[model samples]
Target chain A: NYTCELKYG
Target chain B: ASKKENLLAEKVEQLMEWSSRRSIFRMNGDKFRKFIKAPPRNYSMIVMFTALQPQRQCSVSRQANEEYQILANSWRYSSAFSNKLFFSMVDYDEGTDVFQQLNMNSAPTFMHFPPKGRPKRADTFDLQRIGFAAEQLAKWIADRTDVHIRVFR
Candidate 1:
């Protein structure tokens, strides 16, 4: 799974 | 009437070109909504949302992408293919808007958008449970859309 951090922007 | 029909036809032609070149169309949010939610559509779409960039570091995403490409190629060349279902992908980095619109939080999420309805969670692939492999993906598409895909390797 690709974890989210500071959004994918 | 002509507008609706012609728009869909034009989209089909565009997707065919993309599919031929890459086996799967790399989509942005705009294409995602138009192809999956717009009217006059008579075809289903299997869309995978993922971040394929190396920085994303989703190993599963990379493997699933390859498997998806294999599945798409197989369907493209299969005698049973009738352009009834198209395979596509939306990268999380490139399609951030689409991910937000869909309320997504992870990578390699697969969804099946039927030709004429609002897609539901049930329409999403159980990648967590079923695993994302070309053969299983084919069977799932066949079961969902009645489109036969004989996966090759």
Candidate 2:
């Protein structure tokens, strides 16, 4: 479960 | 239509070289070897370019380079993305090297995704097709291939 959530600024 | 004319553009292709400003790894032959051999055997992706090196006049490579910076920035600002663990690398074609030849790549601006895997393993190489130089598109591609969903952030 090595997952990442992407966020933009 | 001479050699020198094509070598240097129409007197409009010049810029400053700022290596320290780069966030991603502009690897040398040795550095690239070390990277692939280091611990945590996966989550490394590379964008191979057909340019000579460092500075070049390839428009697509330049665009991709800029977009990569944006992607890195977005990841840096978000804990969710940064926590997942990953690495970025870039390779340029060299006449004295055989890396590109071994990989059978004969083009500029190719994207290779290396998903997470166990120790002492080889990463899978993927060639992205028709992908744009946008952070969102890159984010989506990474998510889809790595099984690491880029959580809407």
Candidate 3:
């Protein structure tokens, strides 16, 4: 659920 | 060729030489078990789990990897380096089994393994809280291992 950004897949 | 073959230090050194000539070593599930999860190991290890392939579209993972290498290199060339610590990476594409075992659901997770036992939640880096940088990782390592690293800017 955690990512540096929403752009990541 | 001039020492006892049973010395554990020598054995670990040999393992290092064979694995990436030794800052960082790449790891798979089997390798993770042997080097990080196995006993008779007296070295601390830092492992970064990430998906690095361009197709993965995880740009942050790639950038984290770049910072990771710098952190690893800082430890490698640091005056404190004495095979006491190792830096390694496990790619999600390659180490899927490992990720599943650890219940990993995020990219670019950093974990620290102790010499004698498994890690606590404290051993995991909180990138959300601390942000990311080579020196930041170095400071974290110092806090955990008490080994100061001189990061090269």
Candidate 3 Cα outliers beyond 4 Å, as residue runs: A1-9, B1-7, B19-22
Candidate 2's clash total is: 1
The best candidate by DockQ is 1
List the TM values for chain B, per candidate.
0.91, 0.53, 0.90
Q: List the pairs of residues colliding in candidate 2.
A: A5-B151
The most accurate candidate by lDDT is: 1
What is the C-alpha lDDT profile of model 2 across B1-153, one tens digit per residue? 766555323211210111224435565555544443333333444444444344335555556556656665554455544322333454544322424433533334444444344222222223245454544445554554453323222
Query: Taking the candidates one at a time, how many backbone clashes does each contain?
Result: 0, 1, 0
In terms of TM-score, the best-performing candidate is 1
**Candidate 3 residue-wise lDDT, B77-142, digit = tens:** 767877778888998877888888888876889999998778987899988798779888888888
- Which is the better candidate, 1 or 3, if ranked by lDDT? 1
Model 1 Cα lDDT, one tens digit per residue, B7-73: 8888788767776677688888888877777776888989988888887687888899999989988
Q: Flag regions of model 2 displaced more than 4 Å.
A: A1-9, B1-22, B37-42, B46-56, B93-98, B101-107, B110-129, B144-153
How well does candidate 1 match the true structure in TM-score terms? 0.89
Full-model lDDT, candidate 1: 0.82
